[PDB]
Amino acid sequence: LEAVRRKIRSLQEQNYHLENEVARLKKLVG
Amino acid sequence: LEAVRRKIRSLQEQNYHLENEVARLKKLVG
C-alpha cells in the first residue's frame, strides 16, 4: 500500500505536469 | 488498495501517454 501511495503522488505530479507542459507548448507553438 | 491500484495503473499509463506524447510533439511542432 505504501510503495503504491508514493507512486501515484509522483505520477500525479507529472500527469498534469505533462498535460500542462504538452498544452503550454501547443498554445505557445501553433 | 484499488483506488491507488486502478489509478496507479491509469496514472503511470498516462505518465507515458503524455510522456511520449510530449516527446514527439517536441520533434513535431518543434
Curated annotation (Swiss-Prot), chains A, B:
Domain notes per entry: Residues 89 to 100 and 106 to 125 define the N-terminal activation domain (NTAD) and the central acidic activation domain (CAAD) respectively, which can function independently to promote high-level transcription of the target genes.
PTM characteristics: Phosphorylated by the cyclin-CDK PCL5-PHO85.
Upregulating conditions: Translation is induced by amino acid or purine starvation, or during growth in low or poor carbon sources. Translational repression during nutrient-rich conditions is dependent on four uORFs (upstream open reading frames) present in the 5'-UTR of the mRNA; these promote ribosome dissociation. Translational induction occurs in conditions reducing translation machinery efficiency, leading to ribosomes scanning over the uORFs, and increased translation of the mRNA. The rapid translational induction is followed by transcriptional induction at later time-points, independently of the uORF sequences.
Subcellular location(s) of the protein: Nucleus
Protein name: General control transcription factor GCN4
Family statement drawn from the similarity comment of this UniProt entry: Belongs to the bZIP family. GCN4 subfamily.
General function of this protein: Master transcriptional regulator that mediates the response to amino acid starvation. Binds variations of the DNA sequence 5'-ATGA[CG]TCAT-3' in canonical nucleosome-depleted 5'-positioned promoters, and also within coding sequences and 3' non-coding regions. During nutrient starvation (low or poor amino acid, carbon or purine sources), it activates genes required for amino acid biosynthesis and transport, autophagy, cofactor biosynthesis and transport, mitochondrial transport, and additional downstream transcription factors.
Disruption phenotype: Abolishes recruitment of the mediator complex to the upstream activating sequence (UAS) of amino-acid starvation responsive genes. Decreases RNA level of genes involved in amino acid biosynthesis and cofactor biosynthesis during amino acid starvation or methyl methanesulfonate stress. Growth dependent on amino acid supplementation. Sensitive to amino acid starvation. Sensitive to purine starvation. Decreases cellular glycogen levels during glucose starvation.
Source species, domain of life: Eukaryota
Subunit structure, interactors included: Homodimer. Each subunit binds overlapping and non-identical half-sites that flank the central CG base-pair in the pseudo-palindromic motif 5'-ATGA[CG]TCAT-3'. Interacts with the mediator tail; the interaction with GAL11/MED15 is direct. Interacts with the SAGA histone acetyltransferase complex. Interacts with the SWI/SNF chromatin remodeling complex.
